[PDB]
Paper text:
The Prx subfamily enzyme Prx1, also typically called 2-Cys Prx, is among the most highly expressed, soluble proteins in the cell, and is characterized by two conserved cysteine residues. We used the mechanistically well understood E. coli as a prototype to construct a chimeric Prx, EcAhpC1-186-YFSKHN, composed of EcAhpC (residues 1–186) and the C-terminal YFSKHN-segment of human Prx 2, to be compared with wild-type (WT) EcAhpC. The chimeric EcAhpC1-186-YFSKHN described here demonstrates, that transformation of the human C-terminal YFSKHN-helix into the related bacterial AhpC confers sensitivity to over-oxidation on the chimeric enzyme. Structural details of the oxidized and reduced chimeric EcAhpC1-186-YFSKHN provide novel insights into sub-steps during the catalysis of peroxide reduction, enabling the transition from a fully folded to a locally unfolded conformation. Together with mutational and enzymatic studies these data unravel the fundamental role of the C-terminal tail as a molecular switch that mediates the structural transition between the FF and LU state during the catalytic cycle.
To shine a light on the redox modulated structural alterations in the active site, the crystallographic structure of reduced EcAhpC1-186-YFSKHN was determined to 3.1 Å resolution. No disulphide bond between CP47 and CR166′ was observed in any of the active site interfaces of the decameric EcAhpC1-186-YFSKHN, confirming that the structure fairly represents the reduced form of EcAhpC1-186-YFSKHN. Except for the C-terminus, clear electron density was observed for all the residues and the resolving cysteine (chains C, E, F, H and J), which is located about 10 Å away from the peroxidatic one. Interestingly, two different active site conformations were observed in the reduced EcAhpC1-186-YFSKHN structure, where the residues in the active site region are clearly defined in the electron density map except for the side chains of F45 and V46. The first conformation (chains B-J) reveals that the peroxidatic CP47 adopts helical conformation, bringing the CP47 in a narrow solvent accessible pocket, which is surrounded by the highly conserved active site residues P40, T44 and R120. In the second active site conformation (chain A), the first turn of α2-helix is partially unfolded to place CP47 in the loop conformation. While in the second active site of reduced EcAhpC1-186-YFSKHN, the unfolded CP47 adopts a lower magnitude of rotation, thereby preventing its full exposure towards CR166′ to form a disulphide. For clarity, we termed the first and second active sites of the reduced EcAhpC1-186-YFSKHN as FFlike and LUlike, respectively, to denote the folded and unfolded CP47 in the active site environments. Because of the magnitude of displacement, the data indicate that the FFlike and LUlike state, adopt intermediate conformations, lying between the catalytic FF and LU conformation.
Author numbering:
A (entry chain E), C (entry chain C), G (entry chain J): 1 to 166
B (entry chain D): 1 to 164
D (entry chain F), J (entry chain H): 1 to 167
E (entry chain B), H (entry chain I): 1 to 163
F (entry chain A): 1 to 165
I (entry chain G): 1 to 162
The structure:
C-alpha cells in the first residue's frame, strides 16, 4: 500500500498545545494544509533538534496556511512535562499529539512493531486530505525543516496551478 | 482463562532504576518473590500516591526478599524524567519498567485497548514464577500498600508451610 | 483483554438465601451495587473464614446499598446443607448462588479448567453493571473484608463525584 | 507496514549505462551504498529536471561511493532512445533500470496500480541492503538532489560512528 | 453412535471411600467388573434410595468381584459431608467419585448441559473395559438394584462361556 | 449428548401386526405411551424369550395404554414368516416394525454399523414423544419384561403426579 | 461411473449353502467365473421364480465352472428359513449371501436407498474379477436364466479366444 | 447408485434419421416408450450386427409404440456417412444420435473415460421417463434384439396391468 | 480455454494517433471490424517491419472498414517518441495504444509474465466484439500483412454470407 | 495465459496413417518439427480443402523434416472411412490423430466445450517441444498452407541461426 496520493484515515487523539490539552480529529485538518511530523519518543537526544527546527519555521508555516502535528507513542501528559523540561521543546507553539494506542501511527504505516515507537516520518497533507509528500528516515539521520518548506511551497504551487508548462 | 495459579510469560523490557538504565527479563524474577505494579501513565495525579506508598514500604519488602517492578506503557526515558521532576517519584528505589510495545502488559491481561494504557493492577509472583495474588481497580480507586504486604506475608507463609 | 471497566454478562442461576431457594439473574443486579464473591467449593477449611468475615460486614454493606452473591460450582442444594451444618456459614444472610454449569464462573473468567471449580475472586459491580474492582487470590491466601469495604466506599465516591480521584 | 530499516528484496533487471545494455541484480548492490531513484515514465516533462539534478551531483555521489539506479516501468530499450534525444538525460552516467514486469517497483511498494507506473520515490540503501531513508512525492512536486546528499552523508556518518547520531 | 459394546475412555477423578479420599483412574477398573452409577446431585430426596439399595447388595457384588462407582457433578468434599449427615448414605462402602469438571460424565455421554448435572444412568463394564449394559431413567423413576445384579450375573455368564 | 428426555424423530416404516401389513409413523405414537423394543435379527437362537416375555405381559401393557413396537433391520415380509414358523413369536399380538433402511434404528442411535443390525435396546416414550427410560444390553444378556413394567408404571406416575415421585 | 469392464471391490459376508453357514470373500471368487444375482427381499412372490430358474440351470453352470451368489439385504439366518419353507428355494444348491450392512450391494451400485433393498440385477464376473456383463430390471419384470447362460458362454468364448467376437 | 426406476436427465443433441438431420430432446421422449441403444463407435466390426438386429425388429417395435435411439460419441455427420457405406446400417430407419460432448452418455453413467467412448448398454424407458430395464455388456459380447423385445413386452405388461 | 469465437473484454487505454493523444475503449470498437496488433516493445529491430507492413495496407484496410490498434506494454508517450525518430513508424496513421498496466494484454491472454511484454499476436474482431481469427508467433518470426487481409476478407465474407 | 514458447504436454492417442492404425505419443514428436493441425469434425464441407492443401505441401514438409498431425474429436476408425470416401482426403499421407476423449485437444487449449469439437488451430512445435507459432481461425475462415510453410521456414531459420531474426 503506497500512501502517496491517498486520503488520510479518520482519527481521534489527545494533544498538548500552548499549555492546555485539546482533542484533534480529521475534521480539524479539513480545508487546510497539514504536517504530520512523527518521531520515536520524548526525552531522547535527536528528537528535540528536529522538532526545534520546525518551531523556528512555524511562523513561516502558519503564514502559508499550514498546521503542524507532532506525533509520538507517548501520552499527551508526557508532552506537557517535556515542554516545561526541555528548552528546544518549550518554543513549540504547534500541537503535540499523544498516540498511546498507536492508531494514528498505524494509519500512516509508520510504527516500529518490535519497539512500539513511531519512525521518523513527515507527511505533507493538502486541504482535501490527500498525502502529497512523504519523508522517512532512520534513527540517526535527521530531517531538515528547510527542505520541508520547499516541498510544501512546491505542493501548494501545483495545487493552485495544475499542469504547468514545463 | 484466569491468570491466578499460572506461570508468568517471558519478557524483555528496558527499565530505569537508581539513575541508570537496565534490561529486565523473566530470568531476573526466577528464584525470588516479585511484584509487578501496573499503572496507566506517567505525569498523572493518582499514580504518585500509589507508587509512593509502595516506595515507603520498599525497606520492608526488600527485607522479605521481594523485588518490585513498576510497569506502564510509557518509555524508560519518560520514567527517568518523571523521577527527576516529581518528588513522590524521586524516592522510588525499585525498577520502573517501560512497556511501549505493551507486550508485558498483554502477558498479564491488563491492557486498556482503546486507551493504549495499562490498568491499575498488582501481581504477586513467587520464586517459581506462579501468580499467587491479583488486584485490579478502576481509574479513581487507589491501591493500599499495607494490604499488599498482608498478601505477600500470607503467600510466603503458605509457601513455606502448606496445609494450615 | 481485561474485565475491569466492562459490563457483566447475563446469567440465570439458582441460589439459597435465608432458608429458601430463589432464581437470580442480571436483571436483579440492575440499579444496585453488587459483589460477586467466588470460591472453590463447600465443606473446606479456608472458605468459611472468608464468607464469615463478609457475613459480619453484611449489615454495613446492606446499609451502603450493596448486595452480596457467594458463588461456587457446587449446587444450591449443597449450599442449604453447608448453611445448616457449619456455624460460620449459618450467619450468612446473603445469597449463595449455585453454578453447576460454570456459566457464571466462566462469564467472569474465573474457572479452574482442570479442577472444575471457581478461583478465589471478588468482583465489585456498580448500578450500571460495570466491574469497578477485582481481587483474585491463591488457594492458601485469605481475602480481607475490611479492604473490600474500602474499595466499595472508594468506588461509590468516584461515581457520586465525577472528575475526582483517591 | 514500513520499509524503513528493512532489507531490500532480490531482483533481476536489464539496464542502460554509458552506451551498452547490462543486467543488474541485488548481488551488485552488496557491500555498497545504493540510491534507487523511481519515476513515472520516459518522454515526460518533470522527470528530466529531477534526473538531471542527480546527474549534476553524480561526480560527488561517485566520490562518496554511491550507486545510482534510475527505475521506471519502461523498457531498457526506451531508456537508450530517451538518452539520445533529450539533452538533460544525455549527461546521466548511471544505470537506467527498466522494469516492465514491475517487480523491482513492487519490491519497494511503489507502483500506481491503476496507472501502471512507478511513483516519484527515492530510497537510500546501505552496504548491508537496509533502507536508511525514503522520500516520496506527488506527480507535480520535484525532489531536491542536494537534500539527498545530506541524507546519504548523514547515513554514512551513523553507520561509521556507532553510538553517535546526527541531528 | 451407541456406547454399548465400546471401550470406556480414560479418566482421572477424586473420590471418597470409607473415611478417606483417593484418586481413581481407568487403570483401577482394568482386570475387573465395574459399575459406573451416575446420579444428578447430593442432598436430594430420591438419590439415597437408589444408592442405599446398591449398598445393601454390595456384599453380593464384592463376592462376584465387582466394583461400584457412584458418580455426580458434586465435589468429593461434598460426598464426605453427605455420608456423615444421611443414614442411607452412611452405609455406602463403595467409592463416591466427584466429577466437578464433568469429564467422566461426558465420556459416558450422560451430562445434562443446561442443568450441569448427570442423568440417572447405570453402566456395567467388563474386565476389558467394554460396556456390556446401559440403564438410563428420567428424574422421577428409580433404578432397581436387583435388576442390576441379574444383568451382571448374565454378563459374567456370557463373558466366561463363549457363544 | 444423550437422548434421554428428548423428543423422538419422525419415521415411516412398514410393519406386521395380526396377519396383515400396516404403515406406522410418529403420528401413530402421538399422545400415548410407546415401547420401541429393538433386537438384532429374526431366525436367531437367543430365543424370543425377550419378545415372548413382553408378549406374556402385553395384556397388562394394553390395560395401562402402552403400544409395543418390535423393531429390527429385517423386512416386514420376514416378520410374517417368523411369526408363522416360531411358537414363541406366534403369540405376539403387537406390531413388528421392519427397518431395512435403518432410519428408525439410527434415530435412536442403536445401529451396529459393522454388522448392519440393531442393538438390544428398549426405549420407553411418553405421550409428548419424550424418551423417559432407556435399557441397552449386550448380545448375550437378556432383558426382563417385569422390570420394564416397573419403569412404565413409575413413568406414568411421575407424569400424572408432577413435582413428586 | 460405468461398472462394466472394472474389477469388483473386496467384501466380507455370511452366506447359507446346503444346510451350513459360511464366510464368502473376494478371495473365493479369484480364478473362477462368478455370478452375483441380486434381489430385493425374502418371502416375496417374484424372486422364487427367478432363483428357481437359476437352480435348474446350476447343473450346467457347474460344468462351465461358474459359481452363483444370491445376494439380498436380508440376513443369512433368513436365507436358512426361506430354504426350508419354500419349495422353489429348497432346490438351490448355490450360496445365498446375506448383506444387512448393504456393503456388497453398494459395491455393485445396486441399492434402493429409500427402500433399503437391492435391485433386481445380475452381474457376470470373470476369473480376474472384471465385470463382463450386467443385467438390471424393474420390480415387476423377471430375468431369464436361459439368457444369462448365453451371456456367460459368449463371455467364456471371447476370453479363451482373444480377437474374435460374438 | 442405481439408475433403475429413476427419471432420465435432460439433453439436447443432433441426430441423423432417414436422410435429414434433426434435434432430439426430453420433450420428444415424453408420453412414449423409448430405447437408448448405446455403442462404442462407428466403423467398427461388432457394432453393425447389433444395430442390424434392432433394425430387423423395428417393424415390431414401432407397432408396440417404441422409439429407438442409437447413441455414440461420434458426430451426427459421421452417422450419415456410415449409413451410406455399410449395408447393415443402411436399413436403419430409427434416429442415430451424435453425442460428441458425452452429456447424454454421462447422464446414463455409460462413459468409459480413458477411451472416450460409450459402453454397450441398452436402456428401456417408459412414457413417464422412468428407466425400467438396463442391459450392459463388454466389448466382445454382443446384445440380442429378441431379448430386448421380451423385456419391453414385460415392461408394457406390468405398466398397463398391475396385480 | 480458447479465445476464438468469444467476446472481447472491456478496456480503457490511452493511445497516440496522428500527433494527438486519445483514450480508446471497447465502446469505440462497437459496430465496426477491429485489429488488435500486439508486439513486444518500442525501439526494437523486428517490430518496425511488421508495423510498417500494416501501415502500407492501411489505405486498403480503411476501405474495408477496419480499425487497426497497435498495442504494447510501453506508454503512449513512448509511442510518440518512436513515431518521430523512426521513418517506418512515421507512416503509421493508425492508433498506437499504450498498455503499461498490462490489462488489455492480459484480457487477450498475451502477456510474457517473466519479461513483462506482449507476445507477437494479431487478433481480428467483428462488429459484435467476437474474435474471428488469431495469429501468434515467436520472437524471431515476423507476421505477413498480406495474410492478415485475406483473413479479414474471409471473415467479412462469412459474416455477410452465413 | 499464453501457450506460445511453452512445452507441449504428454499424450497417448490412436491414429490412422496409410491404411494402418498406430499409437502416437509425445515421445514420437521429440527431436523433430511437428505440426498439430486441429479441425472440428469429419464429413464436413470446409475441412477437406484445408487438409488437402497441407497434403499437397506434405512432400516439402517431409523434406524440411516436419511431421504433420491432423487432430479431431472423431475416432481413428472414422478417419479411415473418411480417407476412403473423400478424394481430397485420400491424398493425405500424414498421421490423422483420433481424440475422442479430448485430452490432446484440451492440452492445446482448443476445445469447443458446448459443441465437443476442436477449433481450427495450427500449432508449429520445434524439436525441444516448444510451441513457436499458433494460428487459430473461425468456422468459416480457411487456413493457408503456404503461410504455414513461411512460418516453419522462419522458425527453422531462427533456431539454426542465433542472433538473426526474420522481417
Amino acid at each position: 500500500m503506497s500512501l502517496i496520493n491517498t486520503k488520510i484515515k479518520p482519527f481521534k487523539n489527545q494533544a498538548f498545545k500552548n499549555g492546555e490539552f485539546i482533542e484533534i480529529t480529521e475534521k480539524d485538518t479539513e480545508g487546510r494544509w497539514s504536517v504530520f511530523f512523527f518521531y520515536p519518543a520524548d526525552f531522547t537526544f535527536v528528537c528535540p533538534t528536529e522538532l526545534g527546527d520546525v518551531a523556528d519555521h512555524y511562523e513561516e508555516l502558519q503564514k502559508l496556511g499550514v498546521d503542524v502535528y507532532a506525533v509520538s507513542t507517548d501520552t499527551h501528559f508526557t508532552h506537557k512535562a517535556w515542554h516545561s523540561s526541555s528548552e528546544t521543546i518549550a518554543k513549540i507553539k504547534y500541537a503535540m499529539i499523544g498516540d498511546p494506542t498507536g492508531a494514528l501511527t498505524r494509519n500512516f504505516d509508520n510504527m516500529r512493531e518490535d519497539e512500539g515507537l513511531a519512525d521518523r516520518a513527515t507527511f505533507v497533507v493538502d486541504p482535501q486530505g490527500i498525502i502529497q509528500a512523504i519523508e522517512v528516515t532512520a534513527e540517526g539521520i535527521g530531517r531538515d525543516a528547510s527542505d520541508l518548506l520547499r516541498k510544501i511551497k512546491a505542493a501548494q504551487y501545483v495545487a493552485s496551478h495544475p499542469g504547468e508548462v514545463c
